């Protein structure tokens, strides 16, 4: 359009380009769109492309000051959803120029943050986003990633073991350090603050950091293995966040954690850059299937959020538990794991992957398993997550009848028995009970752990 004509217009003629082949540099998005009744699919897809890019609810004269054809998002393909009929899949391409370099949420909130519909869409859901390699290279990514983290902690050949201190709230700093010390000396690689342990009246953050670090050094000397505790630096302001991270580094803490939900993207991205500058490992917690990622027809799918968290940066990523999930979503669990750790993820509709995602050299992220898991879950966990994972047993360790050290040892024995059995070629999920029962013959701690919780 070369001439200005005020007034509301349809979006199909500008924002629906069925003959458009996406450039390699394009940000691609797959939306599950349920259009308003009567509205054609091509128009509704065009409406989402307009509102998430250069479109306005009415024609503006300022469009003619730039070239819309270059800058606009444009829907280029529509596909039926297998199962539903109301919804359809819109594939929309966004020129890479639309986004701030190294600011992956600026992609995200442009796409769905403030995209209400332009009166043509009654339901939107962002399924997948292809971040082109050109854009990936501008993001910080994980400050260290799997391979460097293993080198720094000198840990090889098995999943790492962690544990959140319980109760979630209420412990004094010294009692917190006692719990940490007992877990670490018993065989856990890591302990961690609970996500909502920041700096409360019952335990100020600086006191916690000091006692925890003393606990970490003591257990490391008494086991001869490197130990860590994710010190939670999540804070109300960035200054406070950086101050706590600086104190963690000052006292020699190898690893910190950040609640991405509490803190937000800006804080997390800054923290991840800080962590790479200061050689501190960064554990990220972002609950999924909670508010944002649980509704199957309304919201942002967790694999998009997973991609964002990897670009924003984190050496570990945790959402929810995987074993309690059904065998059906286990295929989605395996696809989730691959987005975190692999360099190139090919398209696979069965797993929910609509685009090839190329990470290039961006480091992978440790996948974290938590939840109400105990020793009996260990075979499934080892089989599903493999070696490049952290298995966190909070209640499973502090809930052992003989205390933290024994609980840590039980989990450590169970983990190593499963890893050894896997390396011997045994099907550890099918033979799980027998593997644990045999290892329990030499580990009284494991024996009573298996009696404490049910197979």
């Amino acid at each position: 359009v070369k001439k200005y004509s005020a007034g509301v217009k349809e979006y199909r003629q500008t924002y629906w380009m069925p003959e458009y082949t996406p450039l390699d540099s394009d940000i691609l998005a797959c939306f599950k769109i349920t259009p308003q009744p009567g509205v054609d699919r091509e128009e509704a897809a065009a409406a989402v492309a307009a509102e998430s890019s250069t479109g306005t609810w009415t024609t503006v004269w300022t469009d003619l000051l730039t070239d819309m054809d270059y800058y606009k998002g444009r829907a280029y393909r529509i596909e039926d959803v297998p199962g539903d009929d109301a919804a359809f899949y819109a594939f929309i391409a966004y020129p890479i120029d639309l986004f701030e370099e190294g600011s992956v949420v600026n992609v995200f909130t442009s796409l769905v943050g403030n995209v209400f519909g332009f009166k043509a869409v009654r339901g939107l859901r962002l399924e997948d986003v292809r971040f082109p390699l050109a854009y990936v290279k501008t993001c910080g990514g994980p400050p260290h990633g799997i391979q460097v983290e293993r080198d720094k902690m000198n840990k090889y050949g098995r999943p790492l073991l962690g544990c959140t201190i319980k109760p979630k709230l209420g412990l004094s700093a010294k009692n917190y350090g006692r719990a940490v010390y007992e877990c670490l000396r018993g065989g856990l690689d890591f302990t961690k603050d609970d996500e909502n342990i920041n700096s409360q009246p019952f335990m100020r953050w600086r006191d916690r950091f000091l006692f925890v670090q003393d606990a970490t050094e003591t257990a490391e000397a008494q086991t001869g293995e490197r130990k860590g505790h994710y010190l939670n630096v999540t804070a109300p302001t960035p200054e406070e966040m950086y101050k706590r991270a600086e104190f963690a580094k000052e006292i020699g803490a190898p690893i910190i954690m950040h609640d991405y939900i509490t803190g937000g993207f800006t804080a997390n991205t800054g923290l991840a850059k800080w962590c790479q500058d200061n050689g501190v490992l960064l554990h990220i917690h972002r609950a999924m299937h909670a508010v944002i990622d649980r509704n199957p027809n309304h919201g942002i799918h967790f694999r998009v959020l997973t991609k964002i968290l990897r670009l924003s940066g984190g050496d570990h990523l945790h959402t929810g538990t995987v074993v309690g999930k059904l065998e059906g979503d286990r295929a989605s669990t395996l696809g989730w794991i691959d987005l975190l750790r692999e360099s190139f993820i090919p398209e696979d509709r069965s797993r929910g992957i609509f685009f090839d995602q190329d990470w290039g050299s961006m480091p992978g992220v440790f996948a974290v398993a938590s939840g109400g898991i105990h020793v009996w879950h260990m075979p499934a966990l080892v089989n599903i997550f493999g070696d490049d994972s952290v298995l966190q047993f909070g209640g499973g360790t502090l809930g052992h009848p003989w205390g933290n050290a024994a609980g840590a040892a039980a989990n450590r024995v169970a983990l190593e028995a499963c890893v050894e059995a896997r390396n011997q070629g045994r099907d550890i999920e099918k033979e799980g009970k027998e593997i644990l029962t045999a290892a329990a013959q030499h580990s009284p701690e494991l024996k009573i752990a298996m009696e404490t919780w049910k197979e």
């Binding site: 450039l23 070239d67 270059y70 020129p95």
Partner: peptide, 9 residues
């Protein structure tokens, strides 16, 4: 200029 001679064009 700028966007006249893009690879996109």
């Amino acid at each position: 200029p700028r966007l006249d001679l893009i690879e996109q064009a």
